[PDB]
C-alpha cells in the first residue's frame, strides 16, 4: 500500500551487499534485505514532484526502510532516488550506485584528486576497488594497488589503462611501504584508501597525505599520531551511511549519485560483478556474501 | 664586516634553552641561489625545541629569528626571482644557517615572496607565519565555506586573531573560547562581532554543551585547536562530516573516541606549518600561500595583533618571554 510523499516503483535490479550487524545493533520482527535498487516508478504519492510514473530510477534505500529492496516492487521516499541514464543498463546501475558513492566521497570529499597525484588503493580487485581505480585513472592519478590473491593479481594487471604497480600481499611478506615509497621517488603516497598494519601506512604517507580509513574502532598511539603530525597528514573516516542518516546533506549526496550515473552513462566507470541471478536462491547468494566471500558484485534482476 | 645575531644554546639534562648575542660574519652570496637581505623587520615565535631536535642538526649555537621582511642587498649567480632593492618577506627554514635576528641575513630564494608596498615591514613580518598557519588550517586541512560553523581555540592570541578574521571573511559563524579576563575583553573588541565567546575562566561552562546549543544540535563543522577542553568534549561537539584540526603533536586517540569520529564521518588533520620547509618538495604551493596571505594583508582582511616594535638589543629579553608564552600580542624587532 502506497503512502503520500513516497513512491512505489517496480524493481529492475537489486544488488546486495554485506549487512552490518552491529550498526543495526547500535541503531536499535524482520530484517529488510536489499538497498541498491534500479527500478521504474509505478504509482506516485500526492505530493511527490521530481518523479512521474513510467520513469526509470536508481538509488540506495535507507537503513530504516520499512520495505526490503529484495522484492518485486518497493516503496521509497523521493529524495533517496535519482534518474537512471538511458544508456546505462539496470544491473550496472544497481551494482554501481553504492560503490560509486563510496569511491566518490573517499576520493573527492574526504580526499582530493588531481592530475599527477599518487593513491594506494588497497584490494583493488574488489568491486569497490575496481570502481575506485577507474575514478583515480579518470582524474589522472598514478594508482598503486594491493592484490591479496593470484586471482586478484591477474585481475588487476589486465586493466585496459594499466595501473602503475600491483603489490601482491598474497604471499607471506612484501615490503609495501618500501615498494610504494620506491614507486613515488621518496615522496610517498598522497592518498591511501584503506577501504597492511598502520605503521606501514603512516610511513608510506606522503607529505600532507590523506589516510582515508574505514576502520570503525581505530586505536592511535601518541608516537603514531606524532609521525602524522610531522607529515601534516589527515585521517579521514569513510562511513557510507552518513549522508542517508543526516538530513542536511540532502543535495551533495544526490549530486554524487547523479554524477556516479553520469560517468556510468559515459562508461568511465565499469563495475565488476557476478552474472545476474534472479530472485529465487537470492537468499543463498546473500548467505554466501556475509561469509567474507566475493570479489564480484552480486545483483538480482 | 660583522653583525650581531641572536642565538640560543641548550643544557644537556634540561630541555631549557638560553639566549645569547654573538657577533658573526656576513655570509657572502656567490654562485648560488642565495640572496643577501638587509633585514628591516623580524617577528618572534616560540621555538619548538623538540621538533628541532628531531631534525637531527649538530650545532652548539642555534640561530634565532625566522619571520623576516627586508631589502635584497645582493644575489647569487643563479638567483632569478629577485634583484637588489626588491622588498621581500619570508620565513627562514628550520635548518637555516643565519639568524633572522640580525641586520643582514642570507636566505635561499625559494623561501621569499615580494612584499606589497602598502604593507609595513613590521606588519608583513608579524603576519607571514600566523597567516600561513591560519590559511592552511582553514583552507587546506579544512575547507572554509559560507555558512559553516568554526570553533576556534583562544582567538585572543595572534594566530586566533588572524584565524577569526579569515573565518569571518569567508562568511563563517565563529565560536571561540576565551580564557583570561583580558582575553574576554579582547574578543569583545572585534570589528565584526563573533557569534559566541564561551568564557571558560573557571570550570563553570561546558564548551560541548554551549557549542551544541549554538549549532542547534547539528554540531560544529570545523574545530581549530592550536595554542582547556579535553579530547572527548571536542569529539562530542564536532558535527557530522566535520574536520578536527589539531596542533597536538602527541595525541592519544582511543577506540571509543575514534568510533564516534567514524560514525560522524569526521576527518582529523594535524596542523604543522614546518611541513613545507622540512620536506622541501611542493614548495611552489607554499609560495602561493605566502603570496595570498600577503595579498589578504595588503587589501585589509588581515590586521595582525602586533605589539609595538622593539630594537635588536631588547630581542633577548623579549625572546625569553616569547619562549615561555607570556604575552598575547605579536613581538616584532624593528631595524
UniProtKB/Swiss-Prot annotation, chain A:
Identify which top EC class this enzyme belongs to. Answer: oxidoreductase
A GO biological process of this protein is: quinone metabolic process
| Matches recorded under Gene3D superfamilies | Medium-chain alcohol dehydrogenases, catalytic domain
EC numbers = 1.-.-.-
Stretch forming the signal peptide? none
Alphabetized, the UniProt keywords read: Endosome, NADP, Oxidoreductase
Tissue-specificity statement = Ubiquitous.
Tell me which GO cellular component terms the UniProt record holds. cytosol; early endosome
UniProt-recorded Gene Ontology molecular function terms: identical protein binding; NADP binding; NADPH:quinone reductase activity
What superkingdom heads the lineage? Eukaryota
Give its localization.
Answer: Early endosome
Q: Subunit structure, briefly?
A: Homodimer. Component of the FERRY complex composed of five subunits, TBCK, PPP1R21, FERRY3, CRYZL1 and GATD1 with a ratio of 1:2:1:2:4, respectively.
* Family membership noted in the UniProt record: Belongs to the zinc-containing alcohol dehydrogenase family. Quinone oxidoreductase subfamily.
Q: Which PANTHER family does the UniProt entry name for this protein? A: QUINONE OXIDOREDUCTASE-LIKE PROTEIN 1
Q: What does this protein do?
A: Component of the FERRY complex (Five-subunit Endosomal Rab5 and RNA/ribosome intermediary). The FERRY complex directly interacts with mRNAs and RAB5A, and functions as a RAB5A effector involved in the localization and the distribution of specific mRNAs most likely by mediating their endosomal transport. The complex recruits mRNAs and ribosomes to early endosomes through direct mRNA-interaction.
Task: Indicate what this protein is called per its UniProt record.
Answer: Quinone oxidoreductase-like protein 1
**Record organism:** Homo sapiens
Q: What does the record give as the organism's lineage?
A: Eukaryota, Metazoa, Chordata, Craniata, Vertebrata
Amino acid at each position: 500500500v502506497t503512502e503520500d510523499n513516497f513512491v512505489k516503483l517496480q524493481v529492475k535490479a537489486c544488488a546486495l551487499s554485506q549487512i552490518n550487524t552491529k550498526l543495526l545493533a547500535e541503531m536499535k520482527d524482520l530484517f529488510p534485505v536489499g538497498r541498491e535498487i534500479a527500478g521504474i516508478v509505478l504509482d506516485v504519492g500526492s505530493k511527490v514532484s521530481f518523479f512521474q510514473p513510467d520513469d526509470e530510477v536508481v538509488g540506495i534505500l535507507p537503513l530504516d526502510s520499512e520495505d526490503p529492496g529484495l522484492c518485486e516492487v518497493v516503496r521509497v521516499h523521493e529524495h533517496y532516488l535519482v534518474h537512471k541514464p538511458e544508456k546505462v543498463t539496470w544491473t550496472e546501475a544497481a551494482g554501481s550506485i553504492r560503490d560509486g558513492v563510496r569511491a566518490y566521497t573517499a576520493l573527492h570529499y574526504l580526499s582530493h584528486l588531481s592530475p599527477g597525484k599518487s593513491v594506494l588503493i588497497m584490494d583493488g580487485a574488489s568491486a569497490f576497488g575496481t570502481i575506485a581505480i577507474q575514478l583515480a585513472h579518470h582524474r589522472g592519478a598514478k594508482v598503486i594497488s594491493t592484490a591479496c590473491s593470484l586471482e586478484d593479481k591477474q585481475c588487476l594487471e589486465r586493466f585496459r589503462p594499466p595501473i602503475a604497480r600491483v603489490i601482491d600481499v598474497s604471499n607471506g611478506k612484501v615490503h609495501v611501504a618500501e615498494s610504494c615509497l620506491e614507486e613515488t621517488g621518496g615522496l610517498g603516497v598522497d592518498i591511501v584508501l584503506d577501504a597492511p598494519h598502520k605503521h606501514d601506512i603512516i610511513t608510506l604517507l606522503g607529505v600532507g597525505g590523506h589516510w582515508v580509513t574505514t576502520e570503525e574502532n581505530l586505536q592511535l598511539d601518541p608516537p603514531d599520531s606524532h609521525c602524522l603530525f610531522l607529515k601534516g597528514a589527515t585521517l579521514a573516516f569513510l562511513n557510507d551511511e552518513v549522508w542517508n542518516l543526516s538530513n542536511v546533506q540532502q543535495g551533495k549526496y544526490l549530486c554524487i549519485l547523479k554524477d556516479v550515473m553520469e560517468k556510468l552513462s559515459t562508461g568511465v566507470f565499469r563495475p565488476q560483478l557476478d552474472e545476474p541471478i534472479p530472485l529465487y536462491e537470492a537468499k543463498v547468494s546473500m548467505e554466501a556474501v556475509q561469509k567474507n566471500q566475493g570479489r564480484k558484485k552480486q545483483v538480482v534482476q
